[PDB]
Symmetry: D2
Subunit: 123 residues, 4 copies
């Protein structure tokens, strides 16, 4: 449901995610990371699959943040892939991939993988 | 490097995607796949880092496709993270995560992972 | 430290891991999963990097379980990659990959990825 | 299929590994890589599923290598999960996870992921 996803969310590292889910399955917003070579806010864009199922399944979504803004440029990008679960305690559970641009030679070590869980605070 | 990301790309599986790269880091276009509970075109949206570095590195980027359109709804979304490299043969090398919406009981098995290499050939 | 890793551990799904760390960096034991097409115990083998650093870094380790035993055979195998962290509350935090054998055609969907955290109970 | 996993395998990077497959599901041998803080041979231990299925599927397997030997200690371990396929050209297609031991502060960035394809050529 766009509505339930729309809002302010935080994860265990202390990062802030501000998102608006549109009618057409779109996600746009900003991300404020607490870690890495990233200073301030960064623009994020994603999609979410607007017609989930009835049942108590989660809504699948994903989004991307390129770590470049007017203050910094980390030459890397992260994509988060997960599910939105609503209720009194709404959560977004994800797995992410962080890729840094590298030379051919170090490409075998350009991607990190991990997972993040977000808790909603505001709409 | 340069506009170069913009265009039509193909992968091993036969999938095709057409993208437009904007001067400020945005990626927009459509994806049509060859495998899964997918049928037709789907919208894709992503980002790329508009200012790569100048030690022949690739340009980091990522994009998402929710698998729902006017014909099908597979209740899943795929994200591709990787880097673009130009030259006589430009390619995008990625690793992807495909998550399906499940009930909590099946959450442990909701995400698949793989890799895809796209070329304009 | 072999000693700290040796013991009985459980994760959030309710699975049991029994392991012995040997002097030479080896891990051998048994795994009892709570989920999947897996019934009973399965043999596990791994390695752990026996000389970590001084500092409060974790000890890197990994192990494999092939889901075939005398009662079942799921034609799949999982590998867990993580770090052991000791202290009063010793934990093993991992990320795993589950691969099922498939035909060439469905190979794009043969691997699942996720994460597990284990808590020690016994030595 | 059959003994077939046993032998010397090579990957794109130049890495080589020699393995012995036992009738009951065990895999043992040595790994020598071409990249990273690695120098010489390392011991590897894994498992394979000794009874694959009879719809031309691959044989699921996995193995681990801790990167410590009498010469180096990179304080990391790599696990490869994938499947073996025989035929004129047998290959092992894998995805791997490489974890480095960190302090809690750097745990978020302790694991790399990739893919490797091994052949006996
Ligand atoms: N909130 C989170 N921040 C870290 C993880 C995923 S991406 C990462 C921050 C990286 C910052 C930019 C960089 O260092 O490349 N979750
Ligand atoms: N070109 C690719 N197609 C498959 C992989 C990643 S996304 C996937 C197609 C999935 C279609 C929808 C589905 O079956 O869930 N690469
Ligand atoms: N304790 C755990 N069990 C599940 C995860 C990782 S492997 C998985 C169980 C799968 C059982 C066998 C199978 O279904 O293939 N953690
Ligand atoms: N053949 C491969 N070599 C690299 C990847 C996965 S394991 C890795 C070598 C790492 C060596 C030790 C290190 O640098 O940490 N594939």
């Amino acid at each position: 449901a766009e509505a339930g996803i729309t809002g302010t969310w935080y994860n265990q590292l202390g990062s802030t995610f501000i998102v608006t889910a549109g009618a057409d399955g779109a996600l746009t917003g900003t991300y404020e990371s607490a870690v890495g070579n990233a200073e301030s806010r960064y623009v994020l864009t994603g999609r979410y699959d607007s017609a989930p199922a009835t049942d108590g399944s989660g809504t699948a979504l994903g989004w991307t943040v390129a770590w470049k803004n007017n203050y910094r440029n980390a030459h890397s990008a992260t994509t988060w892939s997960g599910q939105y679960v609503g209720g009194a305690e709404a959560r977004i559970n994800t797995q992410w991939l962080l890729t840094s641009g590298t030379t051919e030679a170090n490409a075998w070590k350009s991607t990190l993988v991990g997972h993040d869980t977000f808790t909603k605070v505001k709409p």
